[PDB]
Design a protein around this ligand. Structure first.
Ligand code: EJK
Length: 158
């Protein structure tokens, strides 16, 4: 089991960490959701599906920078929504193919407070998402740590 980002940055067998630079909607109005859809950015595959079923959870989702201070969030994991920052670990998603498949994570972030300025600064760390990969074969328990950075400013008009 291994993963890569849309631009080809890889985390090999055994886990590790990688940075993900995501485009954000430049404007998020009060009462609207800022969607950070990682399913277009993070992809994983099973290296021996003939015998092994890979299990993948969101082990931890943490907020940083502007998202931590001024946004309220949920994370959608494989069609179900959970609080963001995370309190529990999600149900497992299954990977059983050598062809890359999306990691189905998206953040839904709604502004709490804003003065009209830049709520999220371009280049800042907005989230750390830890993917935990286990299987039905051995006791492997590997962490794939995704450091989510904003590519652009996000403004919340007021
Ligand atoms: N014949 C044969 C044969 C073989 F060629 C293989 F490569 C393996 C095999 C390949 C990948 C393996 O592990 C990695 O890929 C797993 C599935 O993605 C993942 O769950 C693990 O954590 C880790 O990332 C493990 Cl353990 C074994 C195997 F079991 C075999 F029996």
């Amino acid at each position: 089991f291994a993963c890569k980002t849309a631009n080809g940055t890889a985390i090999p067998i055994g886990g590790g960490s990688a940075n993900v630079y995501v485009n954000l909607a430049p404007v998020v109005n009060v009462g609207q959701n800022l969607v950070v859809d990682l399913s277009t950015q993070i992809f994983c595959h099973n290296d021996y599906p003939e015998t092994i079923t890979d299990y993948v959870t969101l082990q931890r989702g943490s907020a940083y920078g502007g998202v931590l201070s001024n946004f309220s969030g949920t994370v959608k994991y494989s069609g179900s929504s959970y609080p963001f920052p995370t309190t529990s670990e999600t149900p497992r998603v299954v990977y059983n193919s050598r062809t890359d498949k999306p990691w189905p994570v998206a953040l839904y972030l709604t502004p709490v407070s804003s003065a009209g300025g830049v709520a999220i600064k371009a280049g800042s760390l907005i989230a750390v998402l830890i993917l935990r990969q286990t299987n039905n074969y051995n006791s492997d328990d590997f962490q794939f740590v995704w450091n989510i950075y904003a590519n652009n400013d996000v403004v919340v008009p007021t």
